[PDB]
Design a protein around this nucleic acid. Structure first.
Lengths: 86, 184, 150, 129, 81
RNA sequence: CCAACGGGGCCUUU
């Protein structure tokens, strides 16, 4: 993906699922990307500031999507006590 | 007296502790009976964090079962006389090398003399009053190991403050990291 | 699975993690060794002796309280039987089935079960010859087996 | 009738990885399993792992990070001469420039590239990529 | 489901599993101190006893075997040891 | 100089 002179020779570098590290192919039309608004200290949403997650079609089809997103959001500040490790 | 309570009396620190045995044996008519047959072989001082030191006392293994009847009190007493010390008793055990394919034959190596077996017994002696209830070994991505030893939550107050000294002692004797944990 | 059927059960004992005597137990090792020898003179097998000590006394496991297993303790005192007890019980069963068949030659089912018992004898006896607790050329045979147990 | 404790362990890891789990437990352990996992860990295919004592051959819990495509065992353990190593890598690995074949040699357990530097051979165990 | 702690199971979920399938094996039987109504002599009884344990002082019987736990007799008193 | 990869000797109950 680099040639001998050190030049990049990929077309593009794919996105990877934040739940499972799988590559998201160019035709996985079931995959989605979620944007969560950042919140100002006066309690109002700031325009154009996001926390972002990506999920593969495999996870969504299997019904794990909601549980995975609770875990990710809770190790960021977005949730308090929804998810439990045990 | 002193050279007759040591199995050898080569050096002065053992003479100090030997004297303490003779002293304590008089202070109570009870100890006059129990302590009389006991002897110890060597002492080593190991420095630990916080400036303290561990008085590691080495005992002949066939007599070890006797000290367990008197190891309480003795620790109470000796940590008064030698202020700012932690005292622990260990049995001396042989360890025999593993036979090579080239070596000439010898009598079959008893399993109790293997290196793995001896290190396990050392750890059992350190925490003497408490039982060990489980073990874990962690293999970190950096390529090194740590053991965790889980202790029975019974009478732990007798050792509860010593744990850091045990970690330092065990490392000196073996080179291995351990940590102690107490399940509720 | 079972050696001679489709059964798949998993029931068994589960011995404790701790390898040293429980804190509430307080007899001496010599005391319990005397008990073991006492029952052996009375004619009990190692299996039976272990049961009595478990539930009539505090003895959780003899190997933990003493240093040794019950079978070795008896052998060290000259009380060892001429053949191992599990092989003994197999031969005893075979004799009683063979007796039943003397009266009931139509009992095709019993005839089938006898063949299975005798296969277990051969597989076990072959083991004991290899570790030399039985003499070589010891052999089970239908006629003499009755006197061997009796 | 477990004929190979190593074969069971790598089979459990594959099935967990395919479904997307982050951890797996394997029973029993052995010295050979530990050595095999340490090689996989060195090259970054797995996280840390932890051994549980039980007086009965123990258990292992492994953390999984999503990088592993496949691992597997070769049975029987064929004898391999130094000239043969090039054939096994052509058959088993997906490309000339990543993945590993794993050998037991009297110099220890190691991947096929280390064996070339040290110039040793022995018997094949398995592969990772 | 996909992420869970296998090394620190909760005490409640551990208590309901079969004795061979917990993280480490162990028994769930126990021992009793038992006294007959007459004598002072205590004796120790295994909770799944198979024999009909007598008192030591006399041939009064303390328990009888069943398919599971032993049935203690009437009038006895006991303490879990 | 310095980094990697290979190798020998000695001590640690050996």
């Amino acid at each position: 993906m680099e040639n001998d002179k050190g030049q990049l020779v990929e077309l593009y570098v794919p996105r990877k699922c934040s739940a499972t590290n799988r590559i998201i192919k160019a035709d996985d039309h079931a995959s989605v990307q979620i944007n969560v608004a950042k919140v100002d200290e006066e309690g109002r949403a700031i325009p154009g500031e996001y926390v972002t997650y990506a999920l593969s079609g495999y996870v969504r089809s299997r019904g794990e999507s909601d549980d995975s997103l609770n875990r990710l959001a809770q190790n960021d500040g977005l949730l308090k006590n929804v998810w439990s490790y045990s | 007296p002193q050279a007759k309570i040591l199995s050898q009396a080569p050096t002065e620190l053992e003479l100090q502790v030997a004297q303490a045995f003779v002293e304590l044996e008089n202070s109570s008519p009870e100890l006059k009976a129990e302590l009389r047959p006991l002897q110890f072989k060597s002492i080593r001082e190991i420095d630990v964090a916080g400036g303290k030191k561990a008085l590691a006392i080495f005992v002949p293994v066939p007599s070890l079962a006797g000290f367990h009847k008197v190891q309480t009190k003795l620790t109470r007493e000796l940590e008064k006389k030698f202020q700012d010390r932690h005292v622990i008793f260990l049995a001396e055990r042989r360890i025999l090398p593993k036979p090579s394919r080239t070596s000439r034959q010898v009598q079959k190596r008893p399993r109790s003399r293997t290196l793995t077996a001896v290190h396990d017994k050392i750890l059992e002696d350190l925490v003497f009053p408490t039982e060990i209830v489980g073990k874990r070994v962690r293999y970190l991505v950096g390529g090194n190991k740590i053991q965790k030893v889980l202790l029975d939550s019974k009478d732990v107050q007798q050792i509860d403050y010593k744990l850091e000294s045990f970690q330092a002692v065990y490392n000196k004797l073996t080179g291995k990291q351990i940590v102690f944990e107490i399940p509720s | 699975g079972r050696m001679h059927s489709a059964g798949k059960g998993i029931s068994s004992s589960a011995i404790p993690y701790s390898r040293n005597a429980p804190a509430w137990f307080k007899l001496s090792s010599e005391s319990v060794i005397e008990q073991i020898v006492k029952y052996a003179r009375k004619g009990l097998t190692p299996s039976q002796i272990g049961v009595l000590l478990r539930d009539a006394h505090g003895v959780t496991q003899a190997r933990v309280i003493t240093g040794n297993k019950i079978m070795r303790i008896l052998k060290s005192n000259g009380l060892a039987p001429e053949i191992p007890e599990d092989l003994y019980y197999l031969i005893k069963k075979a004799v009683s089935v063979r007796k039943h068949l003397e009266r009931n030659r139509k009992d095709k089912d019993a005839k089938f079960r006898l063949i299975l018992i005798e296969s277990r004898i051969h597989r076990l006896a072959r083991y004991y010859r290899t570790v030399a607790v039985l003499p070589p050329n010891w052999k089970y045979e239908s006629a003499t087996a009755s006197a061997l147990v009796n | 009738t477990r004929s190979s404790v190593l074969a069971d362990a790598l089979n459990a890891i594959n099935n967990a990885e395919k479904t997307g789990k982050r951890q797996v437990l394997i029973r029993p352990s052995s010295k050979v399993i530990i050595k095999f996992l340490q090689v996989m860990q060195k090259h970054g295919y797995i996280g840390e792992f932890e051994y549980i004592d039980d007086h009965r051959s123990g258990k292992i819990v492994v953390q999984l990070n999503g990088r592993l495509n496949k691992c597997g065992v070769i049975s029987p353990r064929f004898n391999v001469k130094i000239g043969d190593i090039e054939k096994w890598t052509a058959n088993l690995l997906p490309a000339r420039q990543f993945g590993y074949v794993i050998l037991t040699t009297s110099a220890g357990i190691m991947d096929h590239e280390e064996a070339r530097r040290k110039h040793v051979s022995g018997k094949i165990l398995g592969f990772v990529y | 489901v996909l992420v869970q702690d296998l090394l620190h199971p909760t005490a409640a979920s551990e208590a309901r599993k079969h004795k061979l399938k917990t993280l480490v094996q162990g028994p769930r039987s126990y021992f009793l101190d038992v006294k007959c109504p007459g004598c002072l002599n205590i004796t120790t009884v295994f909770s799944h006893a198979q024999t009909a344990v007598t008192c030591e002082s006399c041939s009064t019987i303390l328990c009888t075997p069943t398919g599971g736990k032993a049935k203690l007799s009437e009038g006895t008193s006991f303490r879990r040891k």
